[PDB]
Curated annotation (Swiss-Prot), chain A:
The protein's name: Helicase SRCAP
Role this protein plays: Catalytic component of the SRCAP complex which mediates the ATP-dependent exchange of histone H2AZ/H2B dimers for nucleosomal H2A/H2B, leading to transcriptional regulation of selected genes by chromatin remodeling. Acts as a coactivator for CREB-mediated transcription, steroid receptor-mediated transcription, and Notch-mediated transcription.
Ranges of residues in domain Helicase ATP-binding: 33-198
Gene: SRCAP
Family of this protein: Belongs to the SNF2/RAD54 helicase family. SWR1 subfamily.
Boundaries of the shown chain within the full protein: 243 to 916 of 3230
Organism of origin: Homo sapiens (Human)
From Swiss-Prot, chain B:
Domain of life: Eukaryota
Name used for this protein in its record: Vacuolar protein sorting-associated protein 72 homolog
Biological role stated in the UniProt entry: Deposition-and-exchange histone chaperone specific for H2AZ1, specifically chaperones H2AZ1 and deposits it into nucleosomes. As component of the SRCAP complex, mediates the ATP-dependent exchange of histone H2AZ1/H2B dimers for nucleosomal H2A/H2B, leading to transcriptional regulation of selected genes by chromatin remodeling.
Segments of the chain annotated as binding DNA: 1-41
Section of the entire sequence shown: 166 to 208 of 364
Native species: Homo sapiens (Human)
From Swiss-Prot, chain C:
The organism of origin for this protein: Homo sapiens
Name listed for the protein in its UniProt record: Helicase SRCAP
Quaternary structure (record): Interacts with CREBBP and EP300. May be part of a complex containing SRCAP, CREBBP, CARM1 and GRIP1. Component of the chromatin-remodeling SRCAP complex composed of at least SRCAP, DMAP1, RUVBL1, RUVBL2, ACTL6A, YEATS4, VPS72, ACTR6 and ZNHIT1. Component of a NuA4-related complex which contains EP400, TRRAP/PAF400, SRCAP, BRD8/SMAP, EPC1, DMAP1/DNMAP1, RUVBL1/TIP49, RUVBL2, actin, ACTL6A/BAF53A, VPS72 and YEATS4/GAS41.
Cellular compartments annotated: Nucleus
Residue span(s) of domain Helicase C-terminal: 1-124
Function description: Catalytic component of the SRCAP complex which mediates the ATP-dependent exchange of histone H2AZ/H2B dimers for nucleosomal H2A/H2B, leading to transcriptional regulation of selected genes by chromatin remodeling. Acts as a coactivator for CREB-mediated transcription, steroid receptor-mediated transcription, and Notch-mediated transcription.
Domain of life: Eukaryota
Entire-sequence positions represented here: 2074 to 2199 of 3230
Record: disease: Floating-Harbor syndrome: A rare genetic disorder characterized by proportionate short stature, delayed bone age, delayed speech development, and typical facial features. The face is triangular with deep-set eyes, long eyelashes, bulbous nose, wide columella, short philtrum, and thin lips.
Family per record: Belongs to the SNF2/RAD54 helicase family. SWR1 subfamily.
UniProtKB/Swiss-Prot annotation, chain D:
Domain notes: Binding to MYC is dependent on a Myc domain essential for oncogenic activity.
Cross-link (Glycyl lysine isopeptide (Lys-Gly) (interchain with G-Cter in SUMO2)): 29
Range of the intact protein held here: 197 to 261 of 456
Assembly and oligomerization: Forms homohexameric rings. Can form a dodecamer with RUVBL2 made of two stacked hexameric rings; however, even though RUVBL1 and RUVBL2 are present in equimolar ratio, the oligomeric status of each hexamer is not known. Oligomerization may regulate binding to nucleic acids and conversely, binding to nucleic acids may affect the dodecameric assembly. Interaction of the complex with DHX34 results in conformational changes of the N-terminus of the RUVBL2 subunits, resulting in loss of nucleotide binding ability and ATP hydrolysis of the complex.
Gene, per the UniProt record: RUVBL1
Family (UniProt): Belongs to the RuvB family.
Gene source species: Homo sapiens
Tissue expression as described in the entry: Ubiquitously expressed with high expression in heart, skeletal muscle and testis.
Domain of life from the UniProt record: Eukaryota
Covalent cross-link Glycyl lysine isopeptide (Lys-Gly) (interchain with G-Cter in SUMO1), where: 29
Protein name, as recorded: RuvB-like 1
Cysteine pairs bridged by disulfides in the record: none
Cellular compartment(s): Nucleus matrix; Nucleus, Nucleoplasm; Cytoplasm; Membrane
Miscellaneous notes: High level of autoantibodies against RUVBL1 are detected in sera of patients with autoimmune diseases such as polymyositis/dermatomyosistis and autoimmune hepatitis.
Amino acid sequence: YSDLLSQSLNTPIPLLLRGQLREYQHIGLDWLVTMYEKKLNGILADEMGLGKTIQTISLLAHLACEKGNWGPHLIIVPTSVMLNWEMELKRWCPSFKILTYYGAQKERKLKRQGWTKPNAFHVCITSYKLVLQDHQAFRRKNWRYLILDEAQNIKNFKSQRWQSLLNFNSQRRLLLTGTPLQNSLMELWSLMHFLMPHVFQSHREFKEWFSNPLTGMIEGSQEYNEGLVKRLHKVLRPFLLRRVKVDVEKQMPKKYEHVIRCRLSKRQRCLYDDFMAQMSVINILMQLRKVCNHPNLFDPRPVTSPF
Amino acid sequence: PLTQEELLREAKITEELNLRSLETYERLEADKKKQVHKKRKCP
Amino acid sequence: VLEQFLTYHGHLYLRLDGSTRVEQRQALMERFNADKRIFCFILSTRSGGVGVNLTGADTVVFYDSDWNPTMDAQAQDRCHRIGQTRDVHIYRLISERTVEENILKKANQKRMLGDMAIEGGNFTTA
Amino acid sequence: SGAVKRQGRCDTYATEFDLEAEEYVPLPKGDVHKKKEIIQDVTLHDLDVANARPQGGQDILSMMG
Ligand SMILES: Nc1ncnc2c1ncn2[C@@H]1O[C@H](COP(=O)(O)OP(=O)(O)O)[C@@H](O)[C@H]1O
């Protein structure tokens, strides 16, 4: 896939769009639309602020204009951002019939009245707090493009969303997230299997035999720190597009991270020593975190008054 | 049905204008909502 | 207790918690990023991650960092937004040789894991 | 006891005025109505002298003192 895509990418036109894309957003759109044309799902891992939402909107516009892909498109985004995605779609590409599926039982019942009709809607906007329990109506649907904003909510396959959204009948799948990692390497597997099941058909054990060695590279355990990381990159190369804002919009100021550590007050020292010399490791860690923050979290100093 | 390859690309104009008007009204509502409404008249 | 401490020293502030309404959150954001008098903007680390725009500040002080990363980053990105006019200094407080030391270490480890995993030049060039 | 203290004005109004003589304390946490047990240790002479020299709030008997 990597080689034949590089061959394919040895430039499209942003047709049917109100605004204009930036030089890098146009390149990302080109990459992901070539991915589509090659019948491949991908992850747009552009860092926050780069505007992957506008990139996906322009991608949908191009699919509808050039390829005539006007069929139903499902965009699943967190509830706090549904309004944002709707406003973006309306400001950048108002041509699409937008169905903002949200509300209570009756409101959603009404909004689904007649949605089975062709051309009734072009882009459907919903949220995880909703599709999670209304999957019975969305599962049996012929979606063309499945878009998930802030895919980090699908970080793990034990959260009832990964399963709820896995078997969603769709032709193409797109994941938008700025942090596919920094909880574990298994989140990448949860995101990719949802993206390319037949490629990662092997259960989580296969990528666990990839992470466990890789995790040791940071710790004392065997520290190859080479070869296996390049193999992981090769595996992830044709699927995800990653860009950092420090170079795309380098005009931003610099940020410095300073770490300072202090001693523990006697009132903190005594409580910490007591909890240490005490339940479970989790409860002990929680109590210690509570102590490190402030001892009043347990019991403030008692106000005294006559008897 | 199944014959709107171009009819859809022509009718899209009306929906585009409608959504444009709707989003402009949304922006106008937000703008008028952003006001402060402060009046210290010093009786 | 953080507000109880800040008051003893006399520092303006506008707290922000998950219990606050999105309307109140947006109002506090707009009033803070506009009014220069407020010196502090106490908020939770794992609160609303998107929509937050606090460019009005120029420094960050992480009191209780989380074991896992990517959320302190989302927190740092609340002040390190595009259009920031001044450099952002992120201060991290750790109570010595405690569970906090462990959390910091683990955070660093996870960051290294993520950096070596995804930052391997996954651009459109290759 | 009936004693009511003044910890200060609410903390949210710190931005109201530019500078004021009032002190600002964070909105008290917990339920408005809360109880708690106090394990006090005193002596009998304390009760003796309290019943021999009474005290209270808003009572003119304090003139005795
Ligand atoms: N090419 C562009 N022209 C105008 N505005 C843009 C452009 N790219 C991004 N933006 C702005 O960036 C903001 C971020 O949008 P969005 O992509 O939803 O956030 P995120 O960066 O978290 O994905 C939008 O409000 C949008 O106005």
